[PDB]
Subunit: 113 residues, 4 copies
Amino acid sequence: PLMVKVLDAVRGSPAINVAVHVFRKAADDTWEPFASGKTSESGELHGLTTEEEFVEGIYKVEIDTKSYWKALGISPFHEHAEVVFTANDGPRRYTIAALLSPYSYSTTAVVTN
Amino acid sequence: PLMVKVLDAVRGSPAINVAVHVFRKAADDTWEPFASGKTSESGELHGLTTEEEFVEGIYKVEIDTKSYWKALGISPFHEHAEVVFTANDGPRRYTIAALLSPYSYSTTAVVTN
Amino acid sequence: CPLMVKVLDAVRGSPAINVAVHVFRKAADDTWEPFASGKTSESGELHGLTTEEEFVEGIYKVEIDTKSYWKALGISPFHEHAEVVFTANDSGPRRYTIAALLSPYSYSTTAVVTNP
Amino acid sequence: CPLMVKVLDAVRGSPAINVAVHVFRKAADDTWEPFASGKTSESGELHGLTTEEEFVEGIYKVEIDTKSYWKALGISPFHEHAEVVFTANDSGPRRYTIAALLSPYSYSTTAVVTNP
Ligand SMILES: Nc1ncc(-c2cccc3cccnc23)cn1
Ligand SMILES: Nc1ncc(-c2cccc3cccnc23)cn1
Ligand SMILES: [Ca+2]
Ligand SMILES: [Ca+2]
């Protein structure tokens, strides 16, 4: 139900081995750890969660862009990229995609049935 | 060796049934038709060309964004999106990805071995 | 003006007007503290957030209220906000312009950093 | 200033300076004719391309020479250029700002259209 895909605009490649943490907003307005992983050779992170676990609510996907750029020897601006959205329930799969540059990022959601 | 992927930033979906034409630059600096198709339900267009046909040179990928937006009832700015690049030969596959909004588009290249 | 925020609307091809922007700074106890806030003008720009005196080193978060923007236009957006988190002034004072480009299911942001 | 072009560099977090920009207009015989050209300033902006008199209805192409920009910085880019093609002034005169954000393997562009 939730996949994350990361691309690198400088190298023209998938962004490989990028740490990604997902949080869900708790009733006290704090962020509870929900799922995490590292992107694969294709820049994709699958298997984050299951249908039963992914309930409606506010999620944060935190992509560690700074570590990624430093591992490539490139100087970065942002601490990370945080993408915060509401999951709303018919049948739906979410893909959070991000395109990374050192001083800019773009993110889009691909929500399909 | 060449794939095109198109996303819609307004609807949060793949951009389905988008016409795409690819041209290769001829010796007289004109644009020769090379391949074309329409994006699938996943927003992807595969099978454009073969290894033997896709030689080094300057290519143009013309995405008919205006037709796409009009078919969705949304008012567009651009006539189309044209993405022009040089193909250079080790082992390489090219993905041209585009993210569409009515008054903006973004494109990236994903070049892998 | 060491910190300026500019917001554009990719649907309409226009400045994003009356967009709320909240800026936070990480405190020594590792929580986010309020730093400054404002709203974009008719040009989509937000000037006057801070001053050279107030804008010290730190980790800053600029939270752009994209959800309210789209909801006011009658549209149901995907994101809650667009957030930009960065370390500022580590090698001395700089001027930062944070720009954001908004669509209902996407946003982009960029930083332009100049040396006064 | 009915037509302005702004270019930013996503690698350095800076204006893209000294970027060549060529503008063409489709002729009645369906070919591209030269219309105007210039280069971005130290702010990454290009003003003075055209005038209200000259900038009539038509289909325009704005070709930003991104390849030369990156090659001058010692970088081998992917794209030949970034091109923006649009119909202008169809419902009367408008002011257009074409902005582009550049990386070596990517670019984005947006249009801001205002009614004088
Ligand atoms: N699989 C896939 N997903 C998205 C893109 C993508 C393309 C262009 C711009 C972007 C801006 C933000 C996020 N993603 C994109 C390319 N390939
Ligand atoms: N003055 C100005 N205009 C536009 C942007 C801008 C911001 C974010 C993404 C972009 C994508 C393509 C083009 N421009 C942008 C930033 N400053
Ligand atoms: Ca310091
Ligand atoms: Ca007309």
